[PDB]
Amino acid sequence: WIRPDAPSRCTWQLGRPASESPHHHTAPAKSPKILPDILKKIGDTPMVRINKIGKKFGLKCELLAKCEFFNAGGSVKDRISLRMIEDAERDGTLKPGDTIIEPTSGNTGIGLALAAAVRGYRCIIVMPEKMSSEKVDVLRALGAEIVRTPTNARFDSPESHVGVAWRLKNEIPNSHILDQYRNASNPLAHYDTTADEILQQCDGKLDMLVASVGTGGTITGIARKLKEKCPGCRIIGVDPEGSILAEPEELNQTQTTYEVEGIGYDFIPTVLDRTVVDKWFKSNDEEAFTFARMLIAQEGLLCGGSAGSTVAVAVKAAQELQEGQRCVVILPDSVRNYMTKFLSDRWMLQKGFLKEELKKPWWWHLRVQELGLSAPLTVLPTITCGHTIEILREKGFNQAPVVDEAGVILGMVTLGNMLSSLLAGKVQPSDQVGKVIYKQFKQIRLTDTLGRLSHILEMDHFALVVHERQMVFGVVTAIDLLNFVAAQERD
Amino acid sequence: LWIRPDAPSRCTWQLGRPASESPHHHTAPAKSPKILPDILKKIGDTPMVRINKIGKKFGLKCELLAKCEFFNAGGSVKDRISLRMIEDAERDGTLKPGDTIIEPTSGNTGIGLALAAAVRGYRCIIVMPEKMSSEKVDVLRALGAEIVRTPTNARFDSPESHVGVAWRLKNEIPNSHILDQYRNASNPLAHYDTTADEILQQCDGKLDMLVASVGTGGTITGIARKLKEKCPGCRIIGVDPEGSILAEPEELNQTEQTTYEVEGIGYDFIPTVLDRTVVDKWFKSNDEEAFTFARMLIAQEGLLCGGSAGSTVAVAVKAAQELQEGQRCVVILPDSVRNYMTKFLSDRWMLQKGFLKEEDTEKKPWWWHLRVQELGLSAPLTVLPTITCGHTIEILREKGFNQAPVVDEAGVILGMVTLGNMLSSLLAGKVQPSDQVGKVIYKQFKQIRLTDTLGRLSHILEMDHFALVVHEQMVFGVVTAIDLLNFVAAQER
Ligand code: HEM
Ligand code: HEM
Ligand SMILES: *Cc1c(COP(=O)(O)O)cnc(C)c1O
Numbered sequence: 001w002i003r004p005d006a007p008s009r010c011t012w013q014l015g016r017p018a019s020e021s022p023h024h025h026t027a028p029a030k031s032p033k034i035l036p037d038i039l040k041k042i043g044d045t046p047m048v049r050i051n052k053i054g055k056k057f058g059l060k061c062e063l064l065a066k067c068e069f070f071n072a073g074g075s076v077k078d079r080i081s082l083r084m085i086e087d088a089e090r091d092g093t094l095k096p097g098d099t100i101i102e103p104t105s106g107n108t109g110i111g112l113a114l115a116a117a118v119r120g121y122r123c124i125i126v127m128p129e130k131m132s133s134e135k136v137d138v139l140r141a142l143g144a145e146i147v148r149t150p151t152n153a154r155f156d157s158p159e160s161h162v163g164v165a166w167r168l169k170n171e172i173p174n175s176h177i178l179d180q181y182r183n184a185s186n187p188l189a190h191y192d193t194t195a196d197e198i199l200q201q202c203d204g205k206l207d208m209l210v211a212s213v214g215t216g217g218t219i220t221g222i223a224r225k226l227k228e229k230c231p232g233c234r235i236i237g238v239d240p241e242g243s244i245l246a247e248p249e250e251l252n253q254t255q256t257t258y259e260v261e262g263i264g265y266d267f268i269p270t271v272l273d274r275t276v277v278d279k280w281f282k283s284n285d286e287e288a289f290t291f292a293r294m295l296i297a298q299e300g301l302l303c304g305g306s307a308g309s310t311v312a313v314a315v316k317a318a319q320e321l322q323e324g325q326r327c328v329v330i331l332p333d334s335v336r337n338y339m340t341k342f343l344s345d346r347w348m349l350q351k352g353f354l355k356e357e358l359k360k361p362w363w364w365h366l367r368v369q370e371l372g373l374s375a376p377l378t379v380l381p382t383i384t385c386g387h388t389i390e391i392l393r394e395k396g397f398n399q400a401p402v403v404d405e406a407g408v409i410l411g412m413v414t415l416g417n418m419l420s421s422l423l424a425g426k427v428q429p430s431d432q433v434g435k436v437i438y439k440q441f442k443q444i445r446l447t448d449t450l451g452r453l454s455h456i457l458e459m460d461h462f463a464l465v466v467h468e469r470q471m472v473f474g475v476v477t478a479i480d481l482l483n484f485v486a487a488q489e490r491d
Numbered sequence: 492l493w494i495r496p497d498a499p500s501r502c503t504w505q506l507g508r509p510a511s512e513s514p515h516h517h518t519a520p521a522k523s524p525k526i527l528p529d530i531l532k533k534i535g536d537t538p539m540v541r542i543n544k545i546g547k548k549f550g551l552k553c554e555l556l557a558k559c560e561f562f563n564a565g566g567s568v569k570d571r572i573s574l575r576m577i578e579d580a581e582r583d584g585t586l587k588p589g590d591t592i593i594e595p596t597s598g599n600t601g602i603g604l605a606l607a608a609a610v611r612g613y614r615c616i617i618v619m620p621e622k623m624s625s626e627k628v629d630v631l632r633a634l635g636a637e638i639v640r641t642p643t644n645a646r647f648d649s650p651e652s653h654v655g656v657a658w659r660l661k662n663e664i665p666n667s668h669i670l671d672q673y674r675n676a677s678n679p680l681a682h683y684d685t686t687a688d689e690i691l692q693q694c695d696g697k698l699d700m701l702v703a704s705v706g707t708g709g710t711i712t713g714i715a716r717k718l719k720e721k722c723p724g725c726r727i728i729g730v731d732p733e734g735s736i737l738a739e740p741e742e743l744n745q746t747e748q749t750t751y752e753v754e755g756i757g758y759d760f761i762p763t764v765l766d767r768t769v770v771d772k773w774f775k776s777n778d779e780e781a782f783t784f785a786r787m788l789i790a791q792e793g794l795l796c797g798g799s800a801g802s803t804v805a806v807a808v809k810a811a812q813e814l815q816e817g818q819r820c821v822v823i824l825p826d827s828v829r830n831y832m833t834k835f836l837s838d839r840w841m842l843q844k845g846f847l848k849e850e851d852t853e854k855k856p857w858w859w860h861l862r863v864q865e866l867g868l869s870a871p872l873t874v875l876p877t878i879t880c881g882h883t884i885e886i887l888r889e890k891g892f893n894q895a896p897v898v899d900e901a902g903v904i905l906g907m908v909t910l911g912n913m914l915s916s917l918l919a920g921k922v923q924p925s926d927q928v929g930k931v932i933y934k935q936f937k938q939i940r941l942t943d944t945l946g947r948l949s950h951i952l953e954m955d956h957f958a959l960v961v962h963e964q965m966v967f968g969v970v971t972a973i974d975l976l977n978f979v980a981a982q983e984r
């Protein structure tokens with residue numbers, strides 16, 4: 001069992017000529033008209049300007065974002081995943097058909113599983129139980145085997161993702177742990193490609209770089225190349241509360257687990273070089289999710305939580321900067337991984353990140369009863385179509401809920417939809433109503449708030465106002481709510 | 492005031508007319524600058540990637556190419572028509588700053604419009620069918636769009652249709668516009684001006700067949716017109732889901748079903764922007780093919796694409812059979828998996844909708860149909876949450892055990908504790924020997940019956956590290972993935 005946190009043997013120091021390096025470096029290559037495979041769609045990520053958030057927090061500087069979620073697997077990890085594989089293949093260590101085992105937060109696991117799916121390697125991912133199910137669905141779709149570990153497990157312990165990875169490797173023939181925590185290919189990928197891209201996109205002019213830290217490879221490779229080729233740039237590292245990566249140690253004193261995925265650790269990875277980070281900042285979950293949501297709402301960037309942590313620090317750290325200067329921020333991954341988490345309001349409420357006291361209009365806190373409802377006529381599912389047309393027209397009604405003999409509501413039926421279906425030949429007048437019933441709806445009480453109705457209308461067209469039996473006091477749609485509000489506008 | 496989406500087109504284009512005769516304003520593709528002023532500039536210039544396995548699996552002799560449109564900022568092909576429709580409107584003077592934009596949609600156009608709206612400062616109201624995925628709703632809600640739903644089976648003629656509701660909303664809201672993807676020229680024109688140029692440039696002009704799934708029809712129309720002009724020999728193949736009426740000849744459209752699970756393609760009316768005259772041949776697709784093939788695209792080619800992409804490739808492996816070596820077939824891949832994370836990507840959904848037969852287990856190894864009891868379980872010693880750490884260390888060492896489930900005085904299982912985690916926590920000073928075990932407890936686990944299959948266990952281990960074997964109260968044993976591995980490998984020798 002090799003320790004992920006072993007002190008680095010690298011003899012790099014600022015000032016050493018690049019010629020002195022023992023490592024194999026790879027030049028970035030121009031993308032061909034047609035891509036031989038998707039793995040070539042890694043790198044050359046866009047550098048987009050942040051237009052609102054910085055000014056909202058008083059930055060005078062240009063704030064730029066390196067959007068890494070445009071990589072083929074959707075994360076910054078797709079970079080090292082490729083590199084680590086390719087170098088291994090050149091080492092002769094990785095043979096065709098071989099098994100790759102990797103401890104991960106998920107994104108490296110996705111990149112590796114992707115490359116494995118393409119290049120024909122077996123892939124076993126070992127990730128903590130905290131990480132999102134979306135990553136699991138993706139990994140499962142890529143054909144990767146999945147193993148989980150308890151979140152709070154110490155890295156020293158056998159139950160940790162690293163430990164489980166090694167224990168798996170020992171039992172499986174032709175298996176390798178590329179080990180992102182130790183492999184040089186990880187920071188070197190960012191030293192060779194990512195930093196070059198940043199330097200090229202910025203024309204060499206660059207005042208500050210903010211990056212969240214996990215394995216530390218991104219900030220390490222980028223900071224090393226930046227210290228060499230753009231010495232004045234300040235390197236700002238971001239570490240979650242509960243993590244120990246940050247310096248000075250006094251900052252780390254604190255919670256031990258946190259909701260944000262992909263950053264922070266209970267050990268210092270070998271690839272990480274804390275010497276090149278000029279200053280550290282601590283971040284928390286609330287900041288992270290708040291800012292990520294802000295990134296989406298304001299800048300249109302569909303990025304994940306670490307991106308939010310990063311920007312949340314950047315609006316603080318960049319205050320010292322002034323006009324004409326620029327701050328670049330790394331945005332490690334997409335919202336795809338967190339669709340049911342921070343993107344979801346219910347999860348944010350459930351986790352206590354969103355207080356209910358959720359910016360709303362005057363009508364939000366009003367009861368539905370004030371809408372001016374009218375109780376509709378009810379019909380059986382077994383009633384026939386033309387008959388319903390006659391009933392509805394004869395009473396001047398345009399729609400009727402479909403309720404069972406036992407009084408359970410089955411759905412909704414409309415005059416216009418019926419005429420349309422009949423005129424089109426889709427159904428017969430003698431045909432049963434079930435052929436054209438709108439089966440989907442949601443129920444509400446007279447004492448429900450209008451805003452609750454507004455949330456309900458984002459999933460359903462119809463909302464039936466009902467008693468506690470077969471009793472529909474009224475039917476409300478978005479158009480009705482609109483009509484009420486708009487009528488109230490006229491006064 | 493209700494304009495029909497299915498009104499016959501007024502366009503007087505016909506193959507052979509000089510481009511100079513066109514009344515429309517055309518936009519040239521531009522080189523992307525080093526730094527993007529905003530994310531909307533990250534639309535277009537989508538990669539053309541080669542399919543390496545699937546075509547050969549189905550006996551294609553030709554080069555199969557994919558125009559991967561899911562790399563657009565909003566994640567779909569619709570981001571193109573969203574930008575264009577807006578920009579043109581802004582040039583028309585029709586769209587004013589701060590104005591409200593209402594749009595009927597399957598979602599992707601709505602996401603692109605909501606994105607652009609969020610950037611450019613428009614109010615955005617999306618009207619989409621109840622069938623469409625919750626993921627789209629979550630994204631639209633995050634982008635700040637107001638959202639309204641309509642019944643899936645509502646006829647387009649009916650007041651309850653997304654089109655009809657969109658118009659009805661428009662009539663009640665001042666300073667509101669419906670850009671209308673179903674009628675607006677900016678939709679197909681966006682594909683004629685940009686997407687098609689990209690395909691032509693990426694293919695160096697050489698292109699034998701193009702397969703595209705159809706929705707509003709703007710993609711296939713805009714691409715096919717320019718292709719018919721600049722690459723006449725290329726065949727245009729359209730994909731239409733069963734239950735839809737877009738396909739020709741009408742004989743193909745005859746079907747029992749009217750709704751289908753696949754999102755973004757097919758309609759109960761012929762959109763004005765669609766030009767069926769340029770479609771050389773149509774193919775009908777179903778949900779099973781679509782999802783199977785989408786999953787195949789992910790599993791084999793590493794392309795994280797949605798269901799319409801699956802429909803398209805599923806057609807392509809049929810339609811391209813006539814092609815031979817040296818010829819190439821280009822396929823459109825409209826959107827990403829992000830919209831379908833909890834649908835076809837999710838195995839439980841595929842089971843629930845009946846797309847996945849359980850039998851097709853058959854893919855699985857020998858040990859899959861074996862009971863958990865055969866693992867060689869041993870019942871562990873349990874401890875109270877309230878027991879202290881060093882005490883437990885002593886008990887476990889004295890018994891030769893390495894771990895103990897933590898069960899309540901009431902006998903509810905609270906979790907798990909391992910000797911190694913305790914020792915590690917102690918040596919690090921995180922905890923004291925006199926400290927409560929609950930400071931170090933592994934709270935998360937899953938239960939299983941002794942009669943459960945090993946494969947079920949294998950599914951469980953993808954969400955939890957520990958699986959407790961239990962009766963109805965009592966823990967017969969603790970199993971991890973390593974234990975399953977040791978068992979299988981042991982039986983293997
Ligand atoms: C002049 C430049 C450099 C020199 C001369 C150098 C030298 C070395 C040497 C000799 C080792 C192996 C030591 C041993 O195992 O005995 C090493 C390891 C390593 N290097 Fe470098 N290095 C340079 C730059 C870099 C850069 C720029 C990066 C990343 C951005 C990097 C990342 C690593 C990593 C991650 C290891 C593994 C450490 C370990 O296994 O303990 N190196 N380097
Ligand atoms: C020489 C080329 C073309 C000419 C002369 C032409 C002419 C026209 C004219 C005159 C109209 C409006 C008729 C009216 O409102 O009175 C029109 C509408 C339209 N055009 Fe074109 N067009 C050309 C090419 C195209 C192309 C290449 C596309 C898309 C790929 C296109 C898409 C549309 C659409 C969607 C409409 C709306 C139809 C309607 O309003 O009912 N046109 N075109
Ligand atoms: C890995 C990862 C990081 C951190 O990158 P390092 O290069 O490991 O610092 C941040 N965010 C996400 C989502 C990640 O997966």
Ligand SMILES: *Cc1c(COP(=O)(O)O)cnc(C)c1O
Pocket residue numbers: 567569597598599600704705706707708709710711754755756797799800825826
């Ligand atoms: C819109 C859409 C299509 C079809 O595009 P048209 O250009 O409308 O034919 C296919 N798939 C998805 C996901 C879509 O959103």
